[PDB]
Description:
The structure is cut from a larger assembly and holds five copies of chain A (178 residues) and six copies of chain F (180 residues).
Chain A: H1 2-11, E1 15-18, H2 24-40, E2 46-52, H3 57-69, E3 74-83, H4 86-91, E4 98-100, E5 105-108, E6 112-115, H5 119-144, H6 148-154, E7 159-162, H7 163-169, E8 174-175
Parallel strand pairs in A: 1-2, 2-3, 3-4, 3-5, 4-8
Antiparallel strand pairs in A: 5-7
Helix pairs in contact in A: 2-3, 5-6
Chain F: H1 2-8, E1 11-14, H2 20-36, E2 42-48, H3 53-65, E3 70-79, H4 81-87, E4 94-96, E5 101-104, E6 113-116, H5 117-142, H6 146-152, E7 157-160, H7 161-166, E8 172-173
Parallel strand pairs in F: 1-2, 2-3, 3-4, 3-5, 4-8
Antiparallel strand pairs in F: 5-7
Helix pairs in contact in F: 2-3, 3-4, 5-6
Amino acid sequence: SLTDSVYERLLSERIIFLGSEVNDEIANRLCAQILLLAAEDASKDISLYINSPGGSISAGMAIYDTMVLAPCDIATYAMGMAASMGEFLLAAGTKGKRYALPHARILMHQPLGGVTGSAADIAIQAEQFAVIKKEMFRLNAEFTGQPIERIEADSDRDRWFTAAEALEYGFVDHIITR
Amino acid sequence: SLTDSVYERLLSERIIFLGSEVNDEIANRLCAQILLLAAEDASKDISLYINSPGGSISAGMAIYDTMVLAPCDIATYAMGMAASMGEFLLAAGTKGKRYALPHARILMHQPLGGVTGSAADIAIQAEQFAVIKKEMFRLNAEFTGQPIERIEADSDRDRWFTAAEALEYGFVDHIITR
Amino acid sequence: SLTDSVYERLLSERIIFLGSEVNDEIANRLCAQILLLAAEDASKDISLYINSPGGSISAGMAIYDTMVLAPCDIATYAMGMAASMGEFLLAAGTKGKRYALPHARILMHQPLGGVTGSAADIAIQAEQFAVIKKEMFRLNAEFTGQPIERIEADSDRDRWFTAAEALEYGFVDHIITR
Amino acid sequence: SLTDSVYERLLSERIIFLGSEVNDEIANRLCAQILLLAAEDASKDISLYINSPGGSISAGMAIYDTMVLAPCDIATYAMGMAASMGEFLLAAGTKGKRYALPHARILMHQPLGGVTGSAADIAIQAEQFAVIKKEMFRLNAEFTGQPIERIEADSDRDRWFTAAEALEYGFVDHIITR
Amino acid sequence: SLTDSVYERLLSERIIFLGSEVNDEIANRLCAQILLLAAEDASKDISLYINSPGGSISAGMAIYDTMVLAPCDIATYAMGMAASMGEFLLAAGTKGKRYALPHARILMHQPLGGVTGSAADIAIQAEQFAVIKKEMFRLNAEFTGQPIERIEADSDRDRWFTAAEALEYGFVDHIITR
Amino acid sequence: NPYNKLFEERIIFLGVQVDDASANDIMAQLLVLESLDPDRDITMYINSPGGGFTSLMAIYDTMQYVRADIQTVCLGQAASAAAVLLAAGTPGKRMALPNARVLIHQPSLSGVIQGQFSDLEIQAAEIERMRTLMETTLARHTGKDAGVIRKDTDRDKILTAEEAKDYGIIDTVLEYRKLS
Amino acid sequence: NPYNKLFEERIIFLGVQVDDASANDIMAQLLVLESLDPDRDITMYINSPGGGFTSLMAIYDTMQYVRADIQTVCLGQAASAAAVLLAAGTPGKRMALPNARVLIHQPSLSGVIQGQFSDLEIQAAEIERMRTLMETTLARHTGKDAGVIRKDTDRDKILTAEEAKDYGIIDTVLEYRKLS
Amino acid sequence: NPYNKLFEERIIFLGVQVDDASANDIMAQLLVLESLDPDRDITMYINSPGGGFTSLMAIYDTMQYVRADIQTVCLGQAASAAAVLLAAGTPGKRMALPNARVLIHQPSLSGVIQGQFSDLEIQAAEIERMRTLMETTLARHTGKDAGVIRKDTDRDKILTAEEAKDYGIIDTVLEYRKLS
Amino acid sequence: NPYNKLFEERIIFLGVQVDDASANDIMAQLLVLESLDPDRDITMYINSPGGGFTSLMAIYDTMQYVRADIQTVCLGQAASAAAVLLAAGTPGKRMALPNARVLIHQPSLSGVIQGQFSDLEIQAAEIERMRTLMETTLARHTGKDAGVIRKDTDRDKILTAEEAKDYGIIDTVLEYRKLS
Amino acid sequence: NPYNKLFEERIIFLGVQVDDASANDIMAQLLVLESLDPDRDITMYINSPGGGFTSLMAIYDTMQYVRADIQTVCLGQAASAAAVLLAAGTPGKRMALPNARVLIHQPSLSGVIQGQFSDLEIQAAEIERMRTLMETTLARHTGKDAGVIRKDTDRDKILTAEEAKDYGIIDTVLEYRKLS
Amino acid sequence: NPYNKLFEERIIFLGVQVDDASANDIMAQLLVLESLDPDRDITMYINSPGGGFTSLMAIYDTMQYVRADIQTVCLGQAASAAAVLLAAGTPGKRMALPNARVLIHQPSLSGVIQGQFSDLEIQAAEIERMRTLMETTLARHTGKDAGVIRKDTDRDKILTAEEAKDYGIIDTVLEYRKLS
């Protein structure tokens, strides 16, 4: 497979891609790649390129904890669009190495979900939603430096940022030009 | 796979193809190839052959920023048809190496999209459309040298160019004959 | 894959096949093969065997320009049926090396298409149809030596040629016997 | 793939199979194999084993011309069933090396097709049918030695032959026993 | 593919399997394997293991003639179930080497088919059915030693045999115990 | 509606593919009309692209059975079972409009009858019987030898109204009655 | 419509596959007609390609149960359950048109009955019982020994109207009543 | 409903694709209206995007056959079979509204007719016959030579109401009758 | 039901997408109402999200043709063909409710018309003709130059009831008649 | 049936999603009832989970337009368009049952409107206009400033019957009339 | 049919899943019956496997609102919304047949409600409100504390007719009235 050939050559250069909706398949593949790269050489950086329409929160947390706990620094790049969990994982890179490319778009929005069970089960599902919402906003606040109150207000509806606006906001540290 | 065998042999010659509707799969594969080729040799040119019916704007921006930031010059060729993001990426090659083939067709048109949410969400989606429209036209103006006013007027409806007309307009620098 | 094994062995002998409806997948694969073969050895001929029910015009133009601009001569063979873009690409080989096999069939017909938009968009689509029709007929006239008026009259409805009739008409230079 | 492994080992022994309905995929694969085998060694025979329910006439003509023009003799074997284009290609082998196996069945019938267009297009399609019918019967007459009048009469409806009857009729030269 | 790995290792030991409904794909693969094995070494036996719910008669005849004409002896084993063409091919092995396993089941039944055309075509199809029925029963009689009258009577409806009953009847020569 | 009025005028309109349900409706109409008035004529209008053979013979026997004469008029086309039923009308009252088309051909199946060869021997025998009976019926009503019909119906044989007259399927071609 | 008029003439038209719903409608019609006039005859027209056995016995018992004689006339064809019901009419009043076709064959399933082997032992026993009962019923009404019928119905046995008479399924073949 | 009232005024509304079922309904209406009053005129309103040829000739012969004059008025559009039927009205009474559109073109198939080449020779011959008959019919009613029509109908030829008048398909273009 | 009562009051309710079948029903209603009383007015209520152009011109000519004045009242919305038909009412009697929405835009296709380039040249020519005719009709009824309308209808142009009055599509905006 | 009896008592039952067809039926009923008796009140029962905005304004204008007072009673729930229509009843006669639920929220789309950005600019502008008009209408009938409503309807705001009274959507909550 | 006769006897048959359309029909019937005779009792027969909560409260308020006493009789089963409606009948007239089954359980969703977490906070709040209201209503009519009901309805609680009496859902279990 040509696509895999290219990606594997880049994996040997410590470059990994998040190229689709974050689900469990992507999260598990990507966590495996981070574990493997850190095992091969824990001193060298990993460069994670993000281009994603969004994804599941649990899968995103798998990726995020693997990134945080990896002994190596992980740099992140926003190319194309980094939406909601792409944005989270972008801002989740090590501070000082979070990059946006000049014509990237970064989208922040409150979580989506759904309600399925009996009134009792729905009370439980709603409680868990409340917890998730607070935790995701807390982590965005830690990433960007914005007050959590501002994250909650801004993420109410789709909030689009250009690379420049993302730099001022605090999602990224640098915008790459050349 | 024979198709992949041919493409990989050409990848080793720094030739890469954009052969379908630009979506995230194509954009990510192609960005990976550009990164890889630039890593192997940053002094040599990359030749990008474009034959595409159109595609998504976010994916196209991923490709475009990867092209711009690559340390190597990227030449572009219009074969078959270069429509809307094929046209954008064609005109986005380094100036002086943007080629059309004699019987190529280049199609310029304003962006397409859709509206899905509640009146509030739709106000947001429409605002983002306005921003995208202006940015795409600005970049076409930078590529061709035409006033942005002319890009907006011409792209109102499907505007077809022959290779000769594309040369006069400013999408390409040369038409290849032999 | 056995089919690919056979085709790749033949690719090493500078033999390539156009075996299906010309679309963008076939056109891109075939253009890549022609580019690759010309790169390997630009002095030796390429033998293109054509057996195709028809295809898209834009894809066919990609193939045609790649054939014309390749530094090497390209010979063409009509086996089975060469219909409409198979016929075009057959007649598009270098003059003096366009072959028909004795029981081949060559089909010439005016382009097909469709109309989809609003009255304004339809006016545009119809104008582009007129342009395409004239260009395809002009190129057939250049290939065969027939007046363009005759191409337009003959291609009005399905016009079938036997290999002998195709030789007299001017689609091919020789009919192979042995 | 095990099936391909077996077939490729046999290809190296100059044995090729026509194992399904003749369509363009089979015809192109099989023509490629004949071209390749003849290129490797033009003095040695090719053994073509036929087991097919029928197929398209254009694809069958591609196969047939490739067989005729190959510089090497091509032997044919009827195993299982050789129906309509299997029968044609069986009888199309070089005279003196067309074999039936003892419990093979050979089926001869007039062509099938269909009518789709406007009255004008249908007049054209019917004319082309008449031409095809005559040519297929002429070639069967050349193969078997029967008068063309007899081929036309016998092929009116499904005409089944046993291997012995096929030998007397003239489809094959020998029936293999051991 | 693991399944293919196992089967290919066994092919090198001259063991081949008929593991599904006999159709043209299976018949062609299996005929290719028998031809290949006989070519590699025509003095050594081939061991054919049969486990099949039934299959097409034409495909079965391809297999059967390939078995008969192969220069090497072919031993057959009934494992699981040998139904109708599995049974035929089981009984079709060389006499003295047709084996049943102790808990195998062997099913004999008259052919199935269908009627599709106009009254004239149906008269033809029915005539061909009569011929096929007689030939299949004749061959079963040759295999087992039973009078053809008995084969026709017994095969009227599904006639199940245990391995012991199959040994007494004459489908197999031995039942393997260990 | 128009069809109930036509029925009140003793008119049956055979305007559908002659399926089994269609044959049931036609036979019910013929039986009712005979009951209402055994002496007054019944007119059957025929415009149908096809039908099955079993349904054909059902209608055919009901048409011959009822006391009332049946006038048959071919509008549009009478194809295969409609063609036999057109021929089966009362002699002297089988008529067609000038551009009426009559299509006669051997009976055929659609889909596939599957079973054991022993079942298909029987089914094929019955289908050959149905062909023989169709050809015999047409011979009885057209005056052509059943052998000639057997040859003619091998392939779709399309007759114009005038040819249908010469071939013995209808007695006359209707003249237009326009007053002007 | 024609069917309501036929009903007012004490005519039941068995023109459909004898499903369970169809059997319900037929039995309702027989019961109503008996109530309206127990002495006057009921005529049942039979034209049907098939039906189930359980529905067959439902209709059969209702036909034998009602006080009124039931005249049975085969139009088109009487197949499998329609054939038994044709035989089941009142003796002396079982009739068929000249080209009527009668098809008798053992009962059969469609689809698959699935379950444990212990459930399928019971289902197979019941199906054998249904075959036995079908053959016994035909023997009662045709005069042939049930063993002969059991052999005859092994494969589709198709009888012409005349053969149906000789075989004991009908009492007479109807002559055409055309006045001319 | 409006259509039953129109019928009571001797008005047929040809508002559908002229399929076989549609042709049956139209012919039934024409026959009933002739029966009710052979002398008083019938008016047929035409608004239909298309139809088949066999259905066309069915309706055409019924229109010429009935004693009553048929007035034909094109509303909206008369396409292919509706166009021939518009031309086929009684001379002097073929009319269209000012923006009525008339579309004439050679007959065509949809889907695919499949078979042996020998069957398709016959089917192609019949389709050429149908084209010839369409063109001949239009020549009879328009006054143009059948050769001219054969050329004109090669591609979709769309006529305005005024052009339909000049081309011989209608006798006059209706003036608006608005009182104000 | 409410619609039959409205019809008895000479009210047509154009409440559906103006398809071909819908246009047939509307034209039948207009013709019947003219027949019943040529002098008394007809009121057409318009509430429809769209419709085709061919159906539009069918209804348009029928509306202009009938003797009775047609009052047109826009409820809800009048979109594309409903908008033209709203403009096409009798001058002085074209009215809309205060929040009525009028949407005018160039005609468009849905799906795809496929064929040879030579067929699509004709189809594109006809579609341009339809656009020209739509714009000309609106110019005739609104007083705006057809060129201005051609520019305005390039993109969906949505008019409020008041704007529809100023733009010449309606004569007045209805006042609420609530007694309290 | 119950609904025809309710209509005879001048009762409209708005029991369905307010689609375009539903709005047409409601408007037809209102128009007919006004015609029958302009002075006597009309009662509209509201129980509906939703509806579109264009249909909403159609019904709204018809409700304000007719001479008769309209009493609105909310049974079950009045959601989004039913809620506006509940507010739109005649002041002093807007009522709800004790457990009636009223749901007000900004208008929304379903599916996707696709097109060029220039078309979607227009569609988005129209949707914002529809939101503004909804909020303005509710302000007119509830007494709350349109800005307050614009904020309140941002997310689904569910009111109990008592809250609907305090919020200005209904005038009173109905007491149970049980005699015991 | 039987249901119209039952209605003429002031009987409503709640025999379906209580969907929104079903609730509309029930409320229409209750309103009509109250109008016909405010003093005479209404009997509602309950046999239903389920229903939604919003429909439940719609019917519940209509039942309490009408002047006439409502007698409720449980046939078969009264599940979830049918169970609440059974409890909601007039005290002293809530009855069930001996083997009637009453099933009470907390309200639940089917499918999935999707949206932003902020929308689902509201939807979950409303669903908890609906549970609270269901339990409160049953407490009002059964005499059990709402807390006890809240615990009991956590899982499907199935009551026999006798248990439904002891639990306060019905007043008495009907004795069989067979004369013999």
